[PDB]
Write a protein that binds this ligand. Structure first.
Ligand SMILES: Nc1ncnc2c1ncn2[C@@H]1O[C@H](CSCC[C@H](N)C(=O)O)[C@@H](O)[C@H]1O
Ligand SMILES: Nc1ncnc2c1ncn2[C@@H]1O[C@H](CSCC[C@H](N)C(=O)O)[C@@H](O)[C@H]1O
Ligand SMILES: Cn1ccc(N)nc1=O
Ligand SMILES: Cn1ccc(N)nc1=O
Lengths: 291, 291
């Protein structure tokens, strides 16, 4: 068994302290071990991001514009959690595909069947006005050309919508498929427990102060670094059994999940963080129909 | 006579401490009083910007890419000044129009007859590599549509060229001709002595640290502020005779010019700043054939 003792898990990309040459043979390996793992992956990250905004007092009264939201099964859980906490939020879910019918019939959630373009962002900006906007993007076209195009659209989401905060899907193009340098919004690169086995994807979390928009250039050398740091995390770290983690499941991803869930606010009071987390996890798994 | 006593002149936009409702009747007023005033305007500003970079140690060894450089008569002076100071700089002057023949035959200055597009910026970036780039832009199409297009191209100049510093032409669209909000690079808004009488144009000066690129959104309300602050500066301030300015010319613009010229480095040593300035001004006016 691959056992180890850890203080805390890597919460962000910059914390990863080692790298490994990527082995293309990893791509043939089992990418997922849990049913609805993709919904779980998104639920934990967005729960984490949104609880943070709540902590900063910027969630209550906002309209969350989630683009690339379908099917969005896990969004129903997120919606219930804050709604039950008393936070007032309006949800605007836009995608060209159809959403899970569990999202229907809620006065606080508007579902829109539209693939967004810059022109549309403008009309929704005019229509949402003057509400404060929190952007969550998970759009998907893939080629580096597809990626660049997605990232370019995500930056236009921010410039037109002018949100108070944002969570953007982020995976650096692979160096062996580099095309050209580009810019992405400055933010914290949140690492995702339950991501596919060899995924190099993370979520870029940003909070916009003032009327400024800070960007950061991404080069091929950055791409090489992303690849190696993520490969190390995937191949070595995520394969660890944190034996000093006294919890029903000691696998790295559960240890990592624990740290995200501990930042989540509940109505029910617990004697320990362990008890809150076990509760949130149970609740989450029951909702997604995960054993 | 319109007399007054001033400590220092408004060097940057943020320093302007008052505003005036714009009077459209001002547009019919004499815009210029000096021959080659436009070359003078540009020479003082670029001399100021470049002396600053020299002060920060970022000029020597750089390649200055000046887009929208033709005719560029005043550029010959700038080139001689630094060349005679011992600073090593390569100049790359790109415009679709023709440059003043005085710029020909200098091994350190390359003239290019090309209207730049994003694709071209890419090839020159590959060709300049690995030299450090200082961008100066003075391109001109005008309608707000023309302006936005120019500003959009200027931002692409920075993203592709990735310069160590930049000086960009900047005049906010007029509120009564607003189209949409947009972003411009963060920088100091340098005010221009000898600009036309009612010009609202300034020069955006930026220095790029790290791999970050900070932008700032510009709204119609910002546009209203630009208009009023600039109208106040033009109608009231620039029309002042700074009587406590003991100098051959006490008009506001000369007082303002004095402050820019005092930051300029010379080989010759002077007993006083007044003497250096009088010298630099004389030299500049003689060069441009201004009485
Ligand atoms: N321009 C665009 N506007 C909106 N959605 C888009 C888009 N381009 C792609 N998409 C959507 O991006 C989605 C990627 S899968 C998204 C899963 C979703 N976040 C969930 O929680 O289940 C697809 O549904 C796709 O239709
Ligand atoms: N894409 C482009 N590339 C280069 N120059 C451009 C351009 N679009 C416009 N211009 C140039 O912008 C200039 C504006 S006038 C510039 C005057 C010059 N700075 C001097 O010191 O005399 C024009 O010469 C125009 O041809
Ligand atoms: C995950 N992954 C996939 C392809 C590739 N070239 N590198 C990677 O790190
Ligand atoms: C200079 N200028 C010109 C036109 C206009 N509407 N406002 C101005 O301040």
């Amino acid at each position: 068994m691959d056992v180890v003792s850890l203080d805390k898990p890597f919460m962000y990309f910059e914390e990863i302290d080692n790298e490994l040459d990527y082995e293309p043979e990893s791509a043939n390996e089992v990418a997922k071990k849990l049913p609805y793992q993709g919904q779980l992956k998104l639920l934990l990250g967005e729960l984490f991001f949104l609880s943070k905004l709540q902590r900063h007092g910027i969630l209550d009264g906002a309209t969350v514009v989630y683009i690339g939201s379908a099917p969005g099964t896990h969004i129903r859980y997120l919606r219930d959690h804050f709604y039950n906490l008393g936070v007032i939020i309006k949800w605007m879910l836009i995608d060209g595909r159809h959403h899970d019918p569990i999202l229907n019939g809620l006065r606080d959630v508007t579902l829109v069947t539209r693939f967004v373009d810059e022109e549309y962002l403008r009309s929704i900006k005019k229509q949402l006005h003057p509400s404060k906007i929190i952007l969550i993007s998970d759009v998907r076209s893939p080629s580096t050309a597809d990626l660049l195009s997605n990232y370019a659209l995500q930056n236009v989401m921010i410039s037109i919508l002018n949100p108070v905060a944002s969570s953007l899907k982020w995976r650096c193009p692979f160096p062996d498929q580099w095309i050209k340098d580009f810019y992405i919004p400055h933010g914290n690169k949140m690492l995702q427990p339950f991501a596919p086995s060899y995924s190099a994807e993370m979520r870029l979390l940003s909070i916009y102060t003032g009327e400024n928009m800070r960007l950061t250039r991404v080069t091929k050398s950055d791409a090489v670094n992303y690849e190696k740091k993520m490969y190390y995390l995937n191949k070595i770290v995520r394969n660890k059994v944190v034996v000093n983690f006294d919890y029903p499941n000691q696998e790295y991803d559960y240890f990592h999940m624990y740290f995200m869930l501990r930042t989540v606010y509940c109505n029910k009071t617990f004697p320990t963080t362990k008890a809150k987390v076990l509760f949130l996890q149970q609740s989450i798994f029951r909702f997604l129909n995960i054993p």
